[PDB]
Amino acid sequence: QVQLVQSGAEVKKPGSSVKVSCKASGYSFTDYHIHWVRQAPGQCLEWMGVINPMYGTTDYNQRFKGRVTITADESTSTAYMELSSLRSEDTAVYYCARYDYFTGTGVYWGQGTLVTVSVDIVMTQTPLSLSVTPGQPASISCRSSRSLVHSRGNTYLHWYLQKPGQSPQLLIYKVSNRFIGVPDRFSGSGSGTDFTLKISRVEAEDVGVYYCSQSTHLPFTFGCGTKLEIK
């Protein structure tokens, strides 16, 4: 089974450096890109960078240029993210995620590493939170600053659910494709810049934060999330 296991939580002073590990197993390590995404306390998801472990080639989010270094060790099947000159604004849960070109997005995520410091497409999610009567439907909207159409038949707009205390899990990829084991009560629609995730009947297991994500253009970007509650 594909697994990403990250190093433990870190408490750091401002100005220090942190290096987070991401140990991969269950697939050929060099055949997939490893991306790093952080979740700051305002719960928006911020893409930091990527490593192609076959060649050691990287790409970083400009906001972090000269501060982040992503490395990969093929002999240990481990990817690393080093963040230097830590500010209190860097307090966040750092995640590694394995990207593939069938979904076009991060499918397998590490459990996350809490680090406590003691040209972007804008993704707008609506509503900020909602509560639903058990068994009732729910609808979450995502609007992008520019078209997410990548090429003929390909729009890289995805929906994740982050259950409480868990990592984001992929529900829908490429607007309406349902990921493995995702029940048919989750359905995605839309085109260009306007998208919707519909839940036909909300179950107790559906509680959490839903995110839209685009991987049509670098830097990959996410919506700031929709908290769903049952009430």
Domain coverage including residue 211: 120-223
Give the largest CA-CA distance in the chain.
51
6's CB contacts (< 8 A; 6+ apart) are 20, 21, 22, 23, 94, 95, 96, 110, 111, 112, 113
Q: How many domains does the chain have?
A: 2
Query: Which technique?
Result: X-ray
In a domain, 139, yes or no: yes
In a domain, 165, yes or no: yes
Distance between CA atoms of residues 141 and 158, nearest Å: 12
Q: Each residue of 66-89: b (16+ CB within 10 Å) or e?
A: ebbbbebeeeebbbbbebeebeee
Lay out the sheet containing 3-6: strands in order across.
3-6, 18-25, 78-83, 68-73
The reported resolution of this PDB entry, expressed in Å, is: 1.9
Distance between CA atoms of residues 23 and 33, nearest Å: 13
Shared domain for 74 and 142, answered yes or no, is no
Shared domain for 95 and 197, answered yes or no, is no
Burial class (CB in 10 A: 0-12, 13-18, 19+), 120: middle
Q: Which of 52, 192, 46 is nearest to 120 (CA)?
A: 46
Last residue in a domain, options 119, 135, 152: 119
> How far does the chain reach from its first CA to its final CA, in angstroms?
36
Shared domain for 53 and 156, answered yes or no, is no
Which residues partner with 80 through β-bridges?
21, 71
In a domain, 184, yes or no: yes
Distance between CA atoms of residues 47 and 211, nearest Å: 13
Last residue in a domain, options 98, 119, 140: 119
Shared domain for 2 and 115, answered yes or no, is yes
Shared domain for 7 and 92, answered yes or no, is yes
Burial class (CB in 10 A: 0-12, 13-18, 19+), 141: middle
Shared domain for 1 and 107, answered yes or no, is yes
Burial class (CB in 10 A: 0-12, 13-18, 19+), 8: exposed
Reported as half-sphere exposure (CB side, CA atoms, 13 A), residue 214 has a value of: 28
